[PDB]
Structure 1
Amino acid sequence: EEDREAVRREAERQAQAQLEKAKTKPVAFAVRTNVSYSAAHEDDVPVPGMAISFEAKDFLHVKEKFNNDWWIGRLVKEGCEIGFIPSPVKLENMRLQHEQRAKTPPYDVVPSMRPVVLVGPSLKGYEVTDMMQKALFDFLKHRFEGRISITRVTADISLARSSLAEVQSEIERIFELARTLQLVVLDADTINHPAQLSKTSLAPIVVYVKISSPKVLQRLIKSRGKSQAKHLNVQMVAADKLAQCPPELFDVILDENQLEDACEHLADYLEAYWKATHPPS
């Protein structure tokens, strides 16, 4: 009664307590979800209405552990605020309880800021692609100065040649660069296709630098001289492969033919990602 409604209304006060206090805390880690969640009343959220909702493949920033059943964090999305996240055991328990009444881990740890990776317009290690990507890296360096780190990744991180240890340490380095929520951009030599990082926990923002016309790409390659035109076919084949991918495999597609327009598009996207990852106080 109000015998009981002493404790189970002081619990709600003590929960709202921690929740406001975590608003200022740093992000402990991020996860990419493999499942969706929307709270039902019977889920017994420490503060009613304060559970977050998400779909599979969303990203969550986790601040702290409230108890064994609930974490505190936010959906990485503009406007979304701190709330309760069900822990994996709580998700399992809801399923099990649901089955009883009627009678694949849910989270992957990923960097707190998704690393930006550029693919296209063709293969890296040739002039057209390396130079076009270089101009983009240089733009970002100044456009996001003070909020960004751009780093070369020579080790073959798609292997998660390069030893296992060398790959693991580069992966750990990328996680660390993102820990304080600055933008992270990789110049990753070996990555030419989005499917190359799909099995890692890097969860990149994949930027497709796309030349719409194969004729245009061929002419660009030829403009580099016969030392590059010797390798025309392998570059043309690779660009055609990117062009066959469904657009949803890419987070950003830069098909603008002017550097400044491609830069503005990418900057607008990353500025919005900055907002999604840095909620107002």
Structure 2
Amino acid sequence: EDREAVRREAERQAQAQLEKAKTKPVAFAVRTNVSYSAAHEDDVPVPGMAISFEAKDFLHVKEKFNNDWWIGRLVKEGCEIGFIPSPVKLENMRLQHEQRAKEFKLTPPYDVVPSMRPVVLVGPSLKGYEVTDMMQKALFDFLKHRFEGRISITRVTADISLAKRSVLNNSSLAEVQSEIERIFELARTLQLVVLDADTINHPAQLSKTSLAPIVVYVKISSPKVLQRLIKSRGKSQAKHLNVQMVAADKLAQCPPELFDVILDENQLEDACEHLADYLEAYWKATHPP
């Protein structure tokens, strides 16, 4: 009896926090490096309100509750505000799992990322050449209309592939780091962020940065088809046929898991609808009622 009243009081105060947090902006977002299941949890400020996630999921963090728990939501359609385990809590669980594992004879858990993952287009070949520049332009043009009022499309000329620790902690790096901050700031609005990033032709180029892009592969499946497209643009472009064929072949060797969206449709309208369908789903995931 004097345990229910203590629990009830503590949980009423926790609940009031969640409700107050609902109307606050996202403080910051994280991408998870670990998974977490709230099954057999027992210490969550309000029972059943702990947030489970897989590795490489995205969370929006609104508030801190205590040293064990933050307040926020999994970036997933339908998912509501709840309690997110703090990194120190997750660390206590990783060592606990370890002690158990070594009984057989017998990486930080969160990375800080933009609140909206920036969209980056790669393929069908190298940027700076007509076939790739023009195919990607049609897609950018479609997005500006389909997501009008909900989207930011910005060009990035800086080589943002340089924005990793082995470079930063040891294009000018000042400019690069400036651009990374510009991109984080743009995503704070929670508009869709689309980058026309000049130097990014391969998903590996951004994997060690903190941008966590949505990577869209514009894929021409057929080498012969690409060759004939390039030649159709005239002598100047066709002179650079080999280098463009190499780059496309390189991209096509990538496992599909390196990409978030693979646009291999040969009709522009089908590619556009495939992309819009993905981004509409992401919009819903990042903006709950």
Q: TM-score, normalised by structure 1?
A: 0.95
- Deviation of 1:263 after TM superposition, in Å, equals 1.0
User: What is the distance in 1 between the residues matched to 2:80 and 2:3?
Assistant: 31
SS of alignment partner, residue 165 of structure 1: helix
Deviations for 1:76-115, whole angstroms, at most 9, x for unmatched residues? 111211111110111122344566799x100000000000
- Deviation of 1:8 after TM superposition, in Å, equals 2.3
- Deviation of 1:56 after TM superposition, in Å, equals 0.5
- Deviation of 1:3 after TM superposition, in Å, equals 2.7
- Deviation of 1:43 after TM superposition, in Å, equals 4.8
User: What is the distance in 1 between the residues matched to 2:255 and 2:96?
Assistant: 39
Structure 1 unmatched runs, 5+: none
Residues 74 and 80, structure 1, Cα contact 8 Å, conserved in 2:
yes
- Deviation of 1:120 after TM superposition, in Å, equals 0.3
- Deviation of 1:197 after TM superposition, in Å, equals 0.1
Residues 155 and 166, structure 1, Cα contact 8 Å, conserved in 2:
yes
Deviations for 1:147-182, whole angstroms, at most 9, x for unmatched residues? 001000000000119111100010000000010110
Residues 122 and 236, structure 1, Cα contact 8 Å, conserved in 2:
yes
Q: TM-score, normalised by structure 2?
A: 0.92
User: What is the distance in 2 between the residues matched to 1:101 and 1:127?
Assistant: 58
Residues 255 and 262, structure 1, Cα contact 8 Å, conserved in 2:
yes
- Deviation of 1:24 after TM superposition, in Å, equals 2.1
Q: 1:228 to 1:265 in 2, by over 3 A?
A: same
Q: 1:98 to 1:264 in 2, by over 3 A?
A: closer
User: What is the distance in 1 between the residues matched to 2:100 and 2:141?
Assistant: 59
Residues 43 and 94, structure 1, Cα contact 8 Å, conserved in 2:
no
User: What is the distance in 2 between the residues matched to 1:32 and 1:74?
Assistant: 12
Alignment correspondent of 1:181? 190
Residues 115 and 186, structure 1, Cα contact 8 Å, conserved in 2:
yes
Count of matched residue positions in the alignment of Structure 1 and Structure 2 = 278
Q: 1:54 to 1:260 in 2, by over 3 A?
A: same
Q: 1:94 to 1:123 in 2, by over 3 A?
A: same
Q: 1:257 to 1:101 in 2, by over 3 A?
A: closer
The 10-residue stretch of structure 1 (86-95 or 173-182) with the greater mean CA deviation from structure 2 = 86-95
User: What is the distance in 2 between the residues matched to 1:119 and 1:171?
Assistant: 19
Q: 1:134 to 1:99 in 2, by over 3 A?
A: closer
Residues 117 and 205, structure 1, Cα contact 8 Å, conserved in 2:
yes
Q: What pairs up with 1:28-43 in 2 under 5 angstroms? A: 28-43=27-42
- Deviation of 1:145 after TM superposition, in Å, equals 0.7
Does residue 248 (structure 1) correspond to residue 257 (structure 2)? The answer is yes
Structure 2 unmatched runs, 5+: 102-106, 164-169
SS of alignment partner, residue 181 of structure 1: coil
The 10-residue stretch of structure 1 (162-171 or 18-27) with the greater mean CA deviation from structure 2 = 18-27
Does residue 132 (structure 1) correspond to residue 135 (structure 2)? The answer is yes
User: What is the distance in 1 between the residues matched to 2:283 and 2:140?
Assistant: 17
User: What is the distance in 1 between the residues matched to 2:91 and 2:285?
Assistant: 29
- Deviation of 1:21 after TM superposition, in Å, equals 2.0
SS of alignment partner, residue 200 of structure 1: coil
Give % identity. 100
The 10-residue stretch of structure 1 (15-24 or 25-34) with the greater mean CA deviation from structure 2 = 15-24
Q: What pairs up with 1:111-130 in 2 under 5 angstroms? A: 111-130=114-133
- Deviation of 1:143 after TM superposition, in Å, equals 1.0
Deviations for 1:47-82, whole angstroms, at most 9, x for unmatched residues? 111100001100111111111110111111112111
User: What is the distance in 1 between the residues matched to 2:24 and 2:17?
Assistant: 11
- Deviation of 1:42 after TM superposition, in Å, equals 4.8
User: What is the distance in 1 between the residues matched to 2:57 and 2:129?
Assistant: 35
Cα RMSD after superposing both structures = 1.8
Q: 1:212 to 1:100 in 2, by over 3 A?
A: closer
SS of alignment partner, residue 152 of structure 1: strand
SS of alignment partner, residue 178 of structure 1: helix
